[PDB]
Amino acid sequence: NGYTYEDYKNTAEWLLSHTKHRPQVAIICGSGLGGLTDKLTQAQIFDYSEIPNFPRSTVPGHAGRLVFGFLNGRACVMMQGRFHMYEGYPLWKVTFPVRVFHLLGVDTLVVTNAAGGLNPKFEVGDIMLIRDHINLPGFSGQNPLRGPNDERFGDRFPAMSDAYDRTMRQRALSTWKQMGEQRELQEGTYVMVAGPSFETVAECRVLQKLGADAVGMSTVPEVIVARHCGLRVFGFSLITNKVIMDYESLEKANHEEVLAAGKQAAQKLEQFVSILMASIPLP
Amino acid sequence: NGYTYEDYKNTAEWLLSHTKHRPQVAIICGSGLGGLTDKLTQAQIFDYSEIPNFPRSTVPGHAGRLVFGFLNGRACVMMQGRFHMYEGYPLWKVTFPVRVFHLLGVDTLVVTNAAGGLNPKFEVGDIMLIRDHINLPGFSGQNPLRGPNDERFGDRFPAMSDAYDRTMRQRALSTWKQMGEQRELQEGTYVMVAGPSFETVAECRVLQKLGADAVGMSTVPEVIVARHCGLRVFGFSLITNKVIMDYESLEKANHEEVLAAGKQAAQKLEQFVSILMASIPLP
Amino acid sequence: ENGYTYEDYKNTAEWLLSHTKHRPQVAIICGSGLGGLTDKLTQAQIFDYSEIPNFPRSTVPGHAGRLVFGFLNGRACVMMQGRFHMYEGYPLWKVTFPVRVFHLLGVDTLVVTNAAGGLNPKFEVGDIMLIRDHINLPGFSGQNPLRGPNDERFGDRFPAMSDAYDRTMRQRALSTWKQMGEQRELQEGTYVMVAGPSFETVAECRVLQKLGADAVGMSTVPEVIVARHCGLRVFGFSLITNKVIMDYESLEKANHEEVLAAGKQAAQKLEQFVSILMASIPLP
Ligand SMILES: O=c1[nH]cnc2c(CN[C@H](CO)[C@H](O)CO)c[nH]c12
Ligand SMILES: O=c1[nH]cnc2c(CN[C@H](CO)[C@H](O)CO)c[nH]c12
Ligand SMILES: O=c1[nH]cnc2c(CN[C@H](CO)[C@H](O)CO)c[nH]c12
Numbered sequence A, B: 001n002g003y004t005y006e007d008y009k010n011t012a013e014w015l016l017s018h019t020k021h022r023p024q025v026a027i028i029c030g031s032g033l034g035g036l037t038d039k040l041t042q043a044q045i046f047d048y049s050e051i052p053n054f055p056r057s058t059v060p061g062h063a064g065r066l067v068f069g070f071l072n073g074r075a076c077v078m079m080q081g082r083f084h085m086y087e088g089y090p091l092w093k094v095t096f097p098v099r100v101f102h103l104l105g106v107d108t109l110v111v112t113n114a115a116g117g118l119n120p121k122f123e124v125g126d127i128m129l130i131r132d133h134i135n136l137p138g139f140s141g142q143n144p145l146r147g148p149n150d151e152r153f154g155d156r157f158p159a160m161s162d163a164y165d166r167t168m169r170q171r172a173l174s175t176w177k178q179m180g181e182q183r184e185l186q187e188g189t190y191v192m193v194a195g196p197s198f199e200t201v202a203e204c205r206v207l208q209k210l211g212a213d214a215v216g217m218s219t220v221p222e223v224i225v226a227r228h229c230g231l232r233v234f235g236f237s238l239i240t241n242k243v244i245m246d247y248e249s250l251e252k253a254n255h256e257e258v259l260a261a262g263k264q265a266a267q268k269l270e271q272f273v274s275i276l277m278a279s280i281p282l283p
Numbered sequence C: 001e002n003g004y005t006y007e008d009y010k011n012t013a014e015w016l017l018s019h020t021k022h023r024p025q026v027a028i029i030c031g032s033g034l035g036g037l038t039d040k041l042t043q044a045q046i047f048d049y050s051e052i053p054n055f056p057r058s059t060v061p062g063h064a065g066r067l068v069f070g071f072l073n074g075r076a077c078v079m080m081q082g083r084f085h086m087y088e089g090y091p092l093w094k095v096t097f098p099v100r101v102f103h104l105l106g107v108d109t110l111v112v113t114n115a116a117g118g119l120n121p122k123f124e125v126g127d128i129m130l131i132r133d134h135i136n137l138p139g140f141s142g143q144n145p146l147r148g149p150n151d152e153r154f155g156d157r158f159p160a161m162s163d164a165y166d167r168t169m170r171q172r173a174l175s176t177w178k179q180m181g182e183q184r185e186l187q188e189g190t191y192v193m194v195a196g197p198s199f200e201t202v203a204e205c206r207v208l209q210k211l212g213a214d215a216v217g218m219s220t221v222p223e224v225i226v227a228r229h230c231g232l233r234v235f236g237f238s239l240i241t242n243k244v245i246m247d248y249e250s251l252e253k254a255n256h257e258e259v260l261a262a263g264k265q266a267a268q269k270l271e272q273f274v275s276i277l278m279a280s281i282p283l284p
Helices: A005-018 A034-039 A096-104 A166-178 A201-209 A220-228 A255-264 A266-278 B005-018 B034-039 B096-104 B166-179 B201-209 B220-228 B255-264 B266-273 C006-019 C035-040 C097-105 C167-179 C202-210 C221-229 C256-265 C267-280
Strands: A025-029 A041-047 A065-071 A074-080 A108-117 A127-135 A186-192 A214-216 A232-242 B025-029 B041-047 B065-071 B074-080 B108-117 B127-135 B186-192 B214-216 B232-242 C026-030 C042-048 C066-071 C076-081 C109-118 C128-136 C187-193 C215-217 C233-243
Touching (some): A034 A266, A108 A220, A127 A220, A201 B127, A220 A232, A232 A255, A232 A266, B034 B065, B074 B096, B108 B220, B127 B220, B214 B232, C128 C167, C167 C267
Parallel strands (some): A025 A074, A108 A232, A127 A186, A186 A214, B127 B186, C026 C076
Antiparallel strands (some): A041 A065, A108 A214, B041 B065, B065 B074, C042 C066, C066 C076
């Protein structure tokens, strides 16, 4: 880890000196989901370029801005754009903002992503509650907690079996009928894979049979640092495409599709997240 | 990646300046598969060490020579010997030649390799058509496309589910009867594993039940960057050993047995590659 | 890509060799909270890792950072009290460095010990599981200590691992167990190495279970691999210190404090088991 505690704290203090907003909740917007910053009231925007030690969003459509505001009674900071391992960033860079959020006094993180559907019962545009994850990069060494541990942040060995807040999940489930949607809110396991290339049929069949329900190349490392420093974590994927499972499909996965599915799902995601805010425990 | 796009152009311009051959098809030769250059007419030979940015071949069975010539009419360039991640090479060094072949004007890549049989039916000396792969190092971050993307080669997010040209595979299947062989032509999934040490029984069983028919430590990275820059890929393995699947056996994998079987099959490979050449479509 | 030369391993070996009178046949690597294994050695000689010219540091709790020479029960031993893990951010060629030094010491048998979370339903906390096989997940994807130029003088370019865990010793541990006097049986199974440092999620543990692995830890495999590289005989066992969380309704979680304490509970059992094992090891 090429960042000291002192690195995080300078970023954290820079923000505190540059905004009057004091966020309780941080929200990471995945591909094509940048539009959840739309309903924030009294919003103050920062380009990542502006912020000391911030990596940049290079993939479309990640805008690369940090937005402060109020959403449904809640003091929020939003990541309009995130970072990925496949852009060549070490995981301690990809997850850098999460520690700076904690230093700001954020106690809850919500992580959003576009994800390819593995489970046959998912249609495109489905929202899936992330119940759990499978961390393939982590299994083999790629874990943002590798190296010296700083107990000011958390333990040498934090458990991950309760990563996704059980209570918020139950709340979002029963909350769902207020969305008034003709489709049920999905629950499932997210599997992280590094990319940047999409998956083969063979690879999909393994993922599906590992028990994963959706696949993407993000999010998991953010969760892992978030939990390490004790934040409540809530996550959901938007199912942008169904991964190709047969060898006779002339169909192929593409980012264009995944950004398009993120646009169709704007108003539904806006509303879902809005509602969600109200269900977050006070400090 | 440590290579600028210009670094590739230099190697390409250099090759173009030192041979009048204009390859259409590129061919990468696996361990003990170097004999495939034998049938090139008007062959022109290069030591890898002559070619400005080329890595070296350190594994026995890999001659370290690049040869331009005509294979049964078709203008080819062959990698007599390849590179592996386990030699200490990053994947951007490993697959560097593919990128240069693309700039050479190569439109087709044939990847060859020796593999251990995971599928119970397969025998030593069988040729398996690679239909699809499972990229295990790719799952956890070891993918040659990691880092900034150069649009001059491909897209940030290329699909892989159509990696191994269907038509070429089907044609190879029709045409196998010309070989006058008593075994059939096999078709299956290659799983890439990084080694350099051979698999345990237990690892072999996970690989078997993941849906893999053959195992080795090469090829997939090459294929990923071939496809990323639009080349049509064809791939096959020579099954050189049956990987150990139980604890009572006193047999263990060794590279020497791998090169021994490469030598036994030299005539059939040459005869198969020949074809294969006749049916590669013109530019 | 290994930072160490043959000369480097050799300086360390010769340094130990002049600083001790001991000539160990056997090396034992103690896992988390298995350090208590050093206590039964006779005519002991302790070296801090920081004294030995090329050794790395042990950072994690339950790992003392010591090399101890002595006789276990007439058997000449060297024990690593503490070990190194990849998650501390060490290259695997630092993690495994002492294994090649033990080889140059004249050690021909290596015994690796670890604490592990049980994946197998039938394992109980406090069980000893003989390791028969492993699944090397960082290996699958590149993280293998042998990556890079091969040192010919230690071993082959592509060494086999299917025979890694000496069959005869395991059988002797099996038929000899009646000596231990436990109304629990000696377990046997496959160790799956995961990198860590965080513990596994439920779904992770489910994949690991269906991969056929019986016990999960974050160490051991790299040491085993380079042991066999230089042709040491290898024996492996896990202490099952916790049952891995396998369902969403549970309020329990894996924690390192529970791991360290199960080791302290099991010490007399391990002590006893390790000594009978030393009767099993073949003479040079
Ligand atoms: O099918 C998919 N396979 C893998 N990932 C994925 C995603 C998420 N997007 C990726 C980042 O994690 C990447 O930006 C390509 O869309 C959407 N759809 C898929
Ligand atoms: O059994 C095998 N397990 C793994 N790889 C493999 C190969 C291919 N050869 C390897 C590199 O890919 C390596 O050179 C050892 O043969 C032939 N046979 C096997
Ligand atoms: O449940 C576990 N999951 C992973 N590892 C593990 C161990 C072994 N200890 C680990 C290092 O290998 C780590 O020190 C935390 O205990 C004991 N119990 C477990």
